[PDB]
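User: Hi! Is it possible to get a structure for several chains at once, not just one? Here's what I have:
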Amino acid sequence: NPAENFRVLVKQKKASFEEASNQLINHIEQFLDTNETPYFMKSIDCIRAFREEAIKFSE
Amino acid sequence: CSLLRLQETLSAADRCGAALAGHQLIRGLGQECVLSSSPAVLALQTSLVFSRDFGLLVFVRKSLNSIEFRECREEILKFLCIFLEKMGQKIAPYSVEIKNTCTSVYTKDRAAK
Amino acid sequence: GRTDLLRLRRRFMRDQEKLSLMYARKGVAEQKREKEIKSELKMKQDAQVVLYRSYRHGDLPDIQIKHSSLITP
Amino acid sequence: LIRICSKPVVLPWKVPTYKDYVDLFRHLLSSDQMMDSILADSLNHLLYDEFVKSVLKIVEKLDLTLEIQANLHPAKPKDFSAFINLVEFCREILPEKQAEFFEPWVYSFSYELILQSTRLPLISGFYKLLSITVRNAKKIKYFEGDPEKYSCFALFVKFGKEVAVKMKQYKDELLASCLTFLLSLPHNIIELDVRAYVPALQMAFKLGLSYTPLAEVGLNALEEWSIYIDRHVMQPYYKDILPCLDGYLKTSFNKVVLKHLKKTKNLSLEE
Amino acid sequence: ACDVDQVTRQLYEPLVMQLIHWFTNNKKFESQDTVALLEAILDGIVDPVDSTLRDFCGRCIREFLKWSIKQITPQQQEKSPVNTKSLFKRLYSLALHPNAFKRLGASLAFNNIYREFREEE
Amino acid sequence: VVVRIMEFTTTLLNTSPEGWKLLKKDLCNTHLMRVLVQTLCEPASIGFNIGDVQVMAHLPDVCVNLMKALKMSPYKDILETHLREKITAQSIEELCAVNLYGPDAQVDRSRLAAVVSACKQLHRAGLLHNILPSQSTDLHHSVGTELLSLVYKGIASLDLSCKQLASGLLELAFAFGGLCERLVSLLLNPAVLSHGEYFYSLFSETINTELLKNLDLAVLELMQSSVDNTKMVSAVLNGMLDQSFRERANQKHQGLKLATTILQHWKKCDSWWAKDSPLETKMAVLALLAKILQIDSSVSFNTSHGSFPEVFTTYISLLADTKLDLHLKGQAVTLLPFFLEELRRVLEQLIVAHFPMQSREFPPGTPRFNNYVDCMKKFLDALELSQSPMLLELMTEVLCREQQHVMEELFQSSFRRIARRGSCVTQVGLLESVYEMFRTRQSFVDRSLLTLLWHCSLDALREFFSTIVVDAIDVLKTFDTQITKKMGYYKILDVMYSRLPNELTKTLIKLCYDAFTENLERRRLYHCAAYNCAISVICCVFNELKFYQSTLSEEMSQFDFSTGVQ
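Assistant: Yes, the chains can be modeled jointly so their relative placement is included. Here is the combined structure:
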């Protein structure tokens, strides 16, 4: 749900935004004892989308 | 009640000089204030005409430069303040004469003080 | 002095705020004010009537009673 | 009103009461002086009408069921407690307002109350509220000898005479309401057959001798008949009613400091 | 004894029951108990007011006659001028009086005494 | 005298049937017919009859008994002729068209009310068209039209007397048949100022009272209206459901019947269903169907009993609507206790889409945060009413993803409120489910199991233990997973040791006392846990010091149900 939030956050300013890296690390890391296969699919979609976003401009 | 005796004494307490008379006056005024500070339903009615005669007395006699009268003046102004605040709007007959006395007090020889 | 628990726990203010306690104090004062109001409203009526002679109960009257029982009323 | 009447009564976090709302409703009914200013950037009568219709429909909705185990055994005690709470609340919230707005209901509402009283002629709150409405009607001077007015006259005289003949057989806390109503009638209708009212007022003042409110309401009612009736029929029962009046005639912080006395900023039997 | 107050009556009715139980005694069964009982009748049977007095004295006289019958030997009380028969004549005359107060007093007194008279055979 | 001779005639007609009416026929005139009709129409039109007490209060029904008795009697022809002479609905048709509103005339209002009462008594006597024949059709449509015209020109108002007169005229129209489509057309008036809505807001009580007699024809008419009509159809069904819930003294099967009809009479009009209506229309329709569901029993249409699959699938779809707001979605959720895997999986994926990361990222006062707190409290209420096991598992899973990130005190309070509710076997099913899903995972037991155990029932605890005896015994024998599983097992056994002394526990004393025997803080927690277990085994055994060292309430509830919130 904050995925689109930092998507528009890195779209509006396009800085280095390692905070986005921390946010995606947090999103992925919530996986230790209970499987989250729908959340897992959401997570992989978000990391892919930010992957092309990073490919896009500078990072 | 005793306020009649007290007003008589205060009217009789400004014959000579002897500013100790003014001390008797201020102490007395303290007692009549606290006696009439909290009437139940009745003593206020007598207290109204007592205020009438006392304002008359201070207007006609306590009209000089003696500080023994000046301290009486300030204390009775505060005293009338608290009575009229307590008594509310029931002193309509005495309002215009109180205004006359108060304007006189401003125009009194105390205007040099 | 067996009630030292109350005195030891009476003033543990340290984990509390000052003006919050002040508001609590003044609110308590307000409730005491209307408590006094209702108390004097209750006291408006006459004071409680007190008797002056203890009354025994039975199916036959008890003439054997003290002289106080009649003199005090 | 359902929530207000829902609160129980116990007599000898804090549990609230029911008497606190009286100033709220008084403000609701007399806040014209500021609702006009609110309108700047009538309707009080409309909310009065809504209140009246709501309370009447709700009181007529409520069941009044008792049991046999003379013995008074209500069958729905919680409903009866809510009933007494609401009836006490309504009898204390009406006096400060004027029944000029209540004027449409003086026939129909009173008729419904008469029906309810005929259903159960043992409810003190019935006579409390009837006294309230009838003093409201006499305050607004509704009685003038309109078919609705004549119907009200007939209803009132019938109810008065029947409750006068029935109150002799009632008990305390119940006949007190009846006699309170009886003294609370307007003079014109009770110009007739003072023979019924004389013992009623006699026992009314007899009870007032130990319970003041009955005494002063009887005083007001008495002075009312004294002023508003011809003396012809006044003479005969005076020799009966005056001797009972022999009762009540056996009787026997702050300092020099000036702080404007904020203690004083705020606002029986000898009476 | 029928006044509208708590402590007053709360001690009054014990007194009236106490005196009733004393006057029921067969040693002094006659010549003064008659006055007490006739007054305890005429109070509530004859009054335009205070129906509480009427029912209270009806209960009182019901208890009085109950105490008399349970306590006193019968032959004494029927040989006494006062008995249930005198009460019968009082009620029978009382119903026929033109005054409604007298008739309703008779009715209420009979309603009180029925619960004990029904056991009589 | 009048009332007594009247009831005497009633007794003569009823106790002595028409084979014995010849004695009355011997009177040969029955001249009382020409006074009694005035008596019915007006007490003033007869002897005084004033008094306004039980005698003339009970005059109408005994009079109706008289009219029925004469209706059997052959005198009924002349009696009906005299009734027509006294009133023919043509002597009164102009009298109701005099614009009685305002304080202009009141005797007209009085006489109109009197004739209304007389003919409603005739209805109680069963005399509607035999005495007042209708038009070419089978209605008297003029009354509703004149009511609508009067209320239109009333503001372009009324009185309480006018209000009750209008209600009387409404029930007079209700005495006739076929009025359902008429009133549907009247309420469908789009005259703006609308006007049919104004009429409904005036006389909803009378409208719903009449349409309670209708069962499906009203449902059909509102169906055909529902192609574009939305607000007024919602209002009329609200009136239906409110009156059905209100009527209990007779029965409550009216609500069941209407619910069955409308479920069978909805599927042809689904312009509320799915994305074809505004959002406000969607919350309106979900709230009203929620009221419908709470009317009927849960068992009624919990499985395939009719249109249940369609409405259930629509429930699923509307809750799967991403465009639907999360708070409104939860409001629709709140009626889950009337309910297979499909709902569970769509719910889990939606709540995954709804709650990304705890509550810290949602600041206090943030609208998302407030929607979240509303959601969790309404799931708490829903599970309190439903105790759904897999849904309890979902609540635990979303709950136990961070300590104190969420209002866990509400959750444990709900745990207390549900542990004493439900069947003991059902509760044990919940316990074994939450135990299985346990296999940090410690958060599960820590935040739920002690609470549910201390609020559980004795027999349920006994049977659950007897289920899990060896399932714990084996467990007694990276490694952090083993440590956490041991944490859970020691805590649950420690919790349940306060009930009663198989009897194979003779070694568990050492098996839990072995804590302090051996010599990162995980192990400190381990020793503390096992020592607590020792405490629990000791507190029950070996007393010696050898341990090997209402009516108004109903009305308020009905008002809340009409509100739908509490």
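Chains C and A do not touch (no CB pair under 8 Å). The helical segments of chain C are 4-9, 18-43, 68-71.

User: Great, thank you!
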